[PDB]
C-alpha cells in the first residue's frame, strides 16, 4: 500500500553537537536526512472510521453537524460552514454590513486571500503596516488610514497570535466601524480566555488541511456575533447565487479531528513554549512575543534575528537572513519565508482589475502604495525566520530537542554566520 508512515524514529540528539562543525561546512547535521519528514495532518484510525459513519448520512447533515459541533467549541453565536477560508471571509464581511465602495483597513502583511475577500465584497482594501513584535495590524496606524469611506477594520491573527482586539475594537467603536477577524491561523488561540473568531462583528477562518485544526481538504467557516449579520450573510448567498458550500467529506474529517484537537494543541503549546524559553538564552535568536492575555496557537513560529550584534557590523540584514536560512537548512531545520511580498505589491493590487475594468477600486480615490509606507513589515521580512510544519506538527521530544540543539549550535557560530553572510552576493 501507499502510506506516509515514517519508518525511522528520531534518535535523541547528543548535546555535544552544539560543539560540532556546521553541516554547511561539511559537518554532521543535527537532524539526519532520514528524520526530516513531518506528517501533517495527524491522520488516525478514527478519521477513517469517521468517513464510514458520515458516508451513510445525508451530506447536509454531516456539514451542519460539523458546523454546530465546532461552533459550540468556539462559542460563536452563529456560524456558516463554507468551501474555503476565502469564502468565509467574504461572507463575514458582507454579513457584518460591508457594501460596494466601502474601504476596509487590512494589514499589508497577510495571505492574498484576506484582501481578495475584501475585493469580492466589492470593497477597497486599505493596506496598513504591522506591529514589529506581534506582526499584526498596528492599531497606532489606523488614524492615518481612516477616511469617510472606511466601514470596517480586518485584523489577521497572523501566525496564530491574537491581534490587539482591545485597541482595534476601541478604534472601531469611536469611528463606528465593523470589526472582521481573519482567524485562519488562530485555531484554539485565545485572548482573555476567549477564542479568536468571537471578538469581531463577524469572522472568517480557513479550515484547510494545512491548519492546526484541519478538515479533509478545502473548507472554512464564518462566525457572526449578532443574528442580523448571520441573516444578511444568508440573504447574500440567496441573492448572489454563489455556491460556497462545504463538502461532507471535508466536514467528516473535521468531526473526528475535533475530538483530538485538545491533545495535539497541548503538545504544540508545550513544544513552542520550550523553544521560546531556550531561544531566549541565545544571543542570536528570539521566539515570538506573546502578550500576557494571549495564547498563541503556533501555526507558524517566527524567530527574530539579532542583526545588531557587533559581529554583523556593516552586513545587510537580508544577507544574515539568507545565510542563516542556508545554515539551518543544512542542519535539517527548514527555516523558510511564509510571505515574501506585501499584498499592495502583488499583481492583483498593482493592476487592480478586480471584477473587470477596475471595479470596485474605481469606486473610491486611488492610492499609490510605496515601500516607505510599510517599514515595520519590510523590517520583519529581512530580519526574521519562520518555522511552519516543524511546530505545527505536534512533534516528539527528540525532534523538539533536535530543534533546540540546532539553534544553540548556530548560536555558538555567530562569527562563522557573519563570514558566510558577508560572502553572499548583493541582491538588488
Amino acid at each position: 500500500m501507499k502510506t506516509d508512515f515514517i519508518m525511522v524514529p528520531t534518535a535523541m540528539p547528543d548535546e555535544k553537537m552544539i560543539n560540532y562543525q556546521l553541516a554547511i561546512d561539511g559537518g554532521e547535521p543535527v537532524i539526519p536526512k532520514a528524520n526530516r519528514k513531518t506528517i501533517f495532518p495527524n491522520i488516525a484510525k478514527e478519521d477513517l472510521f469517521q468517513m464510514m459513519i458520515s458516508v451513510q448520512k445525508p451530506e447536509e447533515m454531516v456539514v451542519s453537524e460539523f458546523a454546530e459541533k465546532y461552533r459550540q467549541r468556539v462559542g460563536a453565536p452563529y456560524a456558516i460552514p463554507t468551501a474555503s477560508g476565502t469564502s468565509s471571509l467574504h461572507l463575514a464581511l458582507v454579513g457584518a454590513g460591508v457594501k460596494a465602495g466601502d474601504e476596509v483597513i487590512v494589514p499589508a502583511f497577510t495571505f492574498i486571500a484576506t484582501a481578495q475577500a475584501i475585493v469580492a465584497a466589492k470593497a477597497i482594501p486599505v493596506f496598513a503596516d504591522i506591529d514589529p513584535q506581534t506582526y499584526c495590524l498596528d492599531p497606532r496606524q489606523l488614524d492615518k488610514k481612516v477616511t469617510a469611506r472606511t466601514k470596517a477594520v480586518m485584523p489577521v491573527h497572523v501566525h496564530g497570535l491574537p491581534a490587539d482586539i482591545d485597541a482595534l475594537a476601541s478604534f472601531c467603536r469611536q469611528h463606528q466601524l465593523a470589526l472582521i477577524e481573519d482567524a485562519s491561523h488562530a485555531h484554539s488561540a485565545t485572548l482573555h480566555g476567549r477564542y479568536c473568531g468571537t471578538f469581531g462583528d463577524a469572522a472568517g477562518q480557513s479550515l484547510m488541511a494545512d491548519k492546526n485544526f484541519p478538515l479533509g481538504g478545502e473548507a472554512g467557516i464564518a462566525f457572526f456575533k449578532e443574528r442580523e449579520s448571520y441573516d444578511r450573510a444568508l440573504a447574500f448567498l440567496e441573492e448572489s447565487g454563489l455556491d460556497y458550500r462545504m463538502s461532507w467529506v471535508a466536514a467528516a474529517f473535521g468531526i473526528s479531528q475535533l475530538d483530538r484537537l485538545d491533545y495535539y494543541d497541548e503538545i504544540r503549546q508545550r513544544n513552542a513554549q520550550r523553544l521560546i524559553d531556550e531561544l531566549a538564552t541565545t544571543r542570536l535568536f528570539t521566539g515570538p512575543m506573546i502578550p500576557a492575555a494571549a495564547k498563541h496557537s503556533f501555526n507558524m513560529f517566527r524567530i527574530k534575528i539579532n542583526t545588531a550584534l557587533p559581529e554583523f557590523k556593516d552586513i545587510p540584514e537580508y544577507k544574515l537572513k539568507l545565510a542563516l536560512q542556508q545554515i539551518l537548512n543544512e542542519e535539517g531545520v527548514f527555516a523558510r519565508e511564509w510571505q515574501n511580498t506585501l499584498l499592495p505589491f502583488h499583481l492583483p493590487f498593482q493592476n487592480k482589475k478586480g471584477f473587470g475594468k477596475g471595479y470596485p477600486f474605481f469606486l473610491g480615490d486611488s492610492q499609490e502604495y510605496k515601500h516607505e509606507h510599510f517599514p515595520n513589515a519590510l523590517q520583519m521580512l529581512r530580519s526574521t525566520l519562520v518555522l511552519c510544519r516543524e511546530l505545527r506538527s505536534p512533534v516528539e521530544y527528540e525532534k523538539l530537542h533536535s530543534y533546540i540543539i540546532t539553534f544553540k549550535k548556530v548560536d555558538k557560530n555567530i562569527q562563522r554566520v557573519a563570514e558566510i553572510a558577508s560572502q553572499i552576493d548583493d541582491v538588488p
Binding site: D210, D243, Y244, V249, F355
Partner: protein
C-alpha cells in the same frame, strides 16, 4: 457496493496522507481531469470546488467581465443571479457563454455522448453525485484555460512557480478526497 467503494477510496487517499490540493504528489485531480479530457475531446480542463467557479472561469476566460454582456437565455435562477453579481448584462444578439451539463448517478454512464457537442465551453457540474460541490470546465480555448486557473488562489500558475494578469481571485481549489471519489465513480461507471 457503493458505500464500500467510496469508503475504500477515502481510506486509500487518507492512508497516503496526500489530502492537500496544493501538495506535491497530489495525483487525484490530474487523474480526474485526464479522464474527462479523454471522454470529451477537449485539450484543457480546470477543476473547481463549486459550479460558481466554472461559470466565472468561462465568463472571464472570454473577457465577459464587469460591464460586459452575453446571452443569458438558458440560465436558471441561480446562474442569472451570479451573472448579475459579476456585473454582466444580457443580449440575445450574442452567443451563450457555455453549455452546462448537470451530472448525476442517473446519467454518469452516458458522459461520452453528453460531452460530445459543438460547445465552446463545456461545464460539468458533479455536485449531485453527493461527494461535495464540484465542477469541471472543458475547452479547447487555451486563454479560457489559463484565465480559469489564474482566477484560483494557488492555481496551476502559483504552484509551478507578468503574462496573464490576475484580478479578483477565489479559493475554488477542490479537495483531493472529493476529486478521488468522482474519479472512482467515472472509472466504475465505464469511462476508462
Amino acid at each position: 457496493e457503493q458505500l464500500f467503494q467510496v469508503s475504500f477510496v477515502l481510506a486509500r487517499v487518507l492512508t497516503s496522507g496526500i489530502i492537500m490540493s496544493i501538495e506535491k504528489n497530489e495525483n487525484e485531480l490530474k487523474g480526474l481531469e485526464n479522464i474527462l479530457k479523454k471522454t470529451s475531446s477537449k485539450q484543457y480542463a480546470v477543476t473547481f470546488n463549486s459550479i460558481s467557479g466554472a461559470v466565472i472561469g468561462s465568463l472571464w476566460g472570454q473577457d465577459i467581465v464587469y460591464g460586459e454582456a452575453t446571452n443569458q437565455q438558458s440560465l436558471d435562477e441561480q446562474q442569472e443571479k451570479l451573472f448579475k453579481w459579476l456585473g454582466i448584462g444580457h443580449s440575445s444578439l450574442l452567443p451563450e457563454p457555455y453549455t452546462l451539463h448537470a451530472i448525476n448517478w442517473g446519467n454518469i454512464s452516458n458522459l461520452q455522448k453528453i460531452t460530445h457537442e459543438e460547445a465552446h465551453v463545456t461545464l460539468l457540474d458533479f455536485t449531485k453525485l453527493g461527494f461535495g460541490p464540484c465542477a469541471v470546465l472543458l475547452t479547447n480555448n487555451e486563454t479560457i484555460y489559463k484565465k480559469s486557473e489564474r482566477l484560483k488562489i494557488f492555481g496551476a500558475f502559483d504552484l509551478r512557480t507578468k503574462e496573464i494578469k490576475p484580478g479578483l481571485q477565489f479559493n475554488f481549489r477542490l479537495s483531493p478526497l472529493v476529486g478521488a471519489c468522482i474519479k472512482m465513480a467515472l472509472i466504475k461507471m465505464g469511462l476508462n
